[PDB]
Symmetry: D3
């Protein structure tokens, strides 16, 4: 298995990211995915976006403080105001052996909505939007 | 908590948190991921109570966010345990908001809900059997399920 | 002893809340009380409030990282611009035995002042203020 | 530090801190609780110096906040040890501000002060006797009291 | 990454970070010190990979910051190992930005770069010999230097 | 060796300041220096300043969580929009013996630039600027 999508965030898991027990917890990973996914969404949407939905998720492997956490992003659909982005979470191991090993922690599809200043949906511009063109072209394969 | 449609919060209050500047995305908006984080953290308090020790998250079901939250709003996570297996515990978390930043001030609404699946683990991250003898938190959870 | 007031904040004591030694310290508790008390004050005041005063306080029991910390709020007086709120701090134990036990850590009365945009005192509105009515009605017993 | 009324800071500088965005309440205001936190943290530096180890807070006296603080202002906590008992230490903390955000820029004023009571404890949180033999920090504190 | 002058990023991506509200100075600006912090943290990931354990920073060379960064912009640190000695490792860190907050949106530029010197240390902070037998990270680093 | 300059920041090294390994790292110290140096720069500049440059630096001693960290500031030159500030970093030991000992960790010269609202350089006002006068007078000795 190889990563799919563009790299969105590459983040060290820090002590301030853990729960009270010192474990990197699922919520922190969900939060990285949402934040990272939205970078790509905003790029395509040319402005403010919000998360309207996320698909179910399974966490297959643990993450330790010190480990490097990568979020990868793949736009699957662009609607009028909505954008579906698939986010994969990959870890490069630092804290314990085998050091340097890369593994997939989870993935999920997020749906974002392009919004105006008042929080209402807006049409993603289609004219002179090369971020949208790049995304559609990638979908037209996959 | 009770909304315009007459829905009421279900379960026990896990967390009651103010949405703060340091919780927003870079644009200053309260974002899905922060809510997701609060749900997991809050759900796991209940799961750890029942499990009698360390728990990890293995699954979360799909979620929709129906209404935005502003900085300054009060954000509440309520939990109900829906299933306890050998080492697994399913907790449904509802997120309720009490409006502070914008009118109508004081309005309550439900932003989202979702079932989290947690697993009781030891120190090595290996699954462990939830203790069923003399577990008052579990008995209370199971009585709640027979009733709900 | 039972809690008195409405629940204002329910917060996990986190590693990022400790002093440099890893102890939950009195300052953090004072800070929660002030923040939590002010929620109720703002409700009644219908806008911006600041803390003008806090009564003396004693810390009777320690709090451990992992423990759940609850602030409870009881409005004792509403003046023209000032509001006195009694805050109690209760802990539900997670970190050590007995697990699940609830105890009172401290309590104190905070005085808040309703302020305008420039930091000057303003009259708390008395007309169509059901938060004020609820508070006054509770005082008329308690 | 010296204000318009001619008051001057008393004691030793414990902390010198910028009021930051992440220190505000949700409205963006620097709030009482953050100042209270800084006082306790800063006072305890002096208390730990004298006590020769771990200290906890047992009491704080009443406090008034006379003037607001803006984000960007410099906030200083000064401490004077007023009493050392067997295991207890009383530290008076004054909070001084140097104005940055708003005019008059550079003005200094005292926001609040209060006496904190700390107790020297061991690892189990049990009170311990402050060492009185060969304690230069204590000797300095006591000489300051006879004079301050 | 590729700018208007045709410069391209050199090395491996160490960190890819959003500039957040909580990273600014009190005025809300992204400041030199935060960038400096990210460079050191990111450079040390590569240094620790090669060194096979703990590393500390002993030196940083001079730096200029050519262009400001806004909150919301994506900030990337790229690293190239330039020298490995007995216990020392020199990593050049370039900071690249992808514009988000302001036009032109999506533009990439290099804010700064600088060489950090790290030292491989044990648990007591004492320098240790970087292992040269069976060190694939070191072999890769050295092959990159002979080429680049 | 004695400290030189005015005290700019006096900060406890906290757990949330460490890298993922729990070490106070050079980046955090650089960040304190830049922040602290800029206080003095803003004072003299009478408004917004940014960092355009920093000199090379060497870190001679380690800092432990719990230790007190002081940044000291000495303005070396005022140009039209630029200000050179020398920052020294001193530690008073708390975490390990000898407790109370003070040592110098590093020093470096930072160059700040006075900027307007749009990020462009502006002339530091020379009229009715007693912060500038104090700095120039200190330079005239150093
Ligand atoms: C997102 C939001 C504006 C959509 O409201 P709305 O009344 O349905 O707006 P619209 O009818 O214009 O729908 C906008 C788009 O979202 C899509 N959508 C709505 N609900 C959806 C859901 N549950 N799942 C997937 N797509 C959804 C619509 O089909 C539409 O798509 P399109 O424009 O590509 O055709 C509103 O639900 C909201 O503000 N939610 C909170 C968002 C938020 O702040 N999240 C952060 C965490 S709280
Ligand atoms: C928790 C973990 C040890 C379970 O792994 P495992 O090999 O499947 O162990 P088990 O097969 O015994 O499963 C334990 C329980 O979880 C349940 N479970 C496992 N995978 C599940 C899934 N994806 N969805 C729902 N339930 C699941 C099992 O049915 C089992 O239930 P039971 O004991 O009540 O009958 C493992 O998946 C893990 O360590 N994941 C990382 C968790 C984590 O750190 N998450 C947060 C950040 S990544
Ligand atoms: C709060 C503040 C506006 C009051 O200033 P002021 O000149 O006394 O204003 P007023 O005379 O209008 O007094 C306002 C109310 O506060 C009350 N008050 C003033 N000082 C008080 C004190 N020490 N204790 C209790 N109440 C007090 C007054 O009696 C009056 O009450 P009322 O309107 O119900 O009759 C001013 O002291 C201030 O801005 N302080 C700093 C507040 C702050 O920012 N705190 C956060 C931590 S720094
Ligand atoms: C510190 C603590 C062990 C002291 O408890 P204790 O049973 O009263 O122990 P002692 O009776 O020996 O009191 C120790 C000293 O504190 C003083 N003291 C106790 N309570 C006090 C009070 N409420 N106000 C002022 N001084 C007080 C005593 O007079 C005694 O003084 P001395 O040794 O100088 O003569 C205890 O109260 C505690 O652990 N509280 C929690 C502290 C804490 O964690 N606070 C921060 C967050 S909750
Ligand atoms: C600082 C900045 C405005 C200067 O741009 P500029 O086009 O050179 O502006 P100027 O020509 O007016 O130069 C302004 C001053 O800086 C000085 N300066 C410029 N580059 C310098 C450098 N590398 N080292 C020292 N001084 C420098 C100039 O000599 C001039 O000094 P003076 O007014 O006292 O005579 C621009 O480089 C910038 O915005 N950089 C990013 C700053 C930033 O945001 N840093 C935070 C971390 S990213
Ligand atoms: C790392 C440290 C142990 C090295 O100290 P030392 O007594 O000089 O040890 P050494 O003489 O063996 O030097 C180790 C290596 O660093 C190099 N080095 C030392 N000082 C240097 C300097 N100031 N500039 C560039 N390289 C330097 C040496 O040349 C040597 O290289 P080599 O092993 O590849 O041949 C020490 O300086 C230290 O603990 N400093 C604190 C580091 C720290 O905590 N920084 C972050 C926050 S303060
Ligand atoms: Ca290896
Ligand atoms: Ca809180
Ligand atoms: Ca109302
Ligand atoms: Ca029990
Ligand atoms: Ca600071
Ligand atoms: Ca002036
Ligand atoms: Ca991040
Ligand atoms: Ca564009
Ligand atoms: Ca000593």
């Amino acid at each position: 298995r190889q990563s799919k999508g563009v790299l969105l965030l590459r983040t060290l898991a820090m002590p301030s990211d853990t729960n009270a027990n010192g474990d990197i917890f699922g919520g922190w990973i969900m939060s990285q995915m949402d934040m990272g996914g939205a970078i790509l969404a905003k790029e395509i949407a040319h402005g403010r976006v919000v998360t309207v939905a996320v698909e179910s998720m399974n966490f297959i492997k643990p993450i330790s403080v010190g480990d490097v956490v990568c979020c990868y992003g793949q736009c699957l659909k662009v609607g009028r105001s909505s954008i579906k982005i698939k986010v994969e979470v990959w870890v490069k191991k630092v804290a314990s052996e085998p050091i340097g090993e890369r593994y997939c922690v989870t993935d999920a599809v997020f749906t974002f909505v392009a919004v105006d200043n008042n929080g209402r949906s807006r049409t993603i511009p289609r004219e002179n939007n090369q971020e949208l063109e790049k995304a559609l072209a990638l979908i037209s394969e996959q």
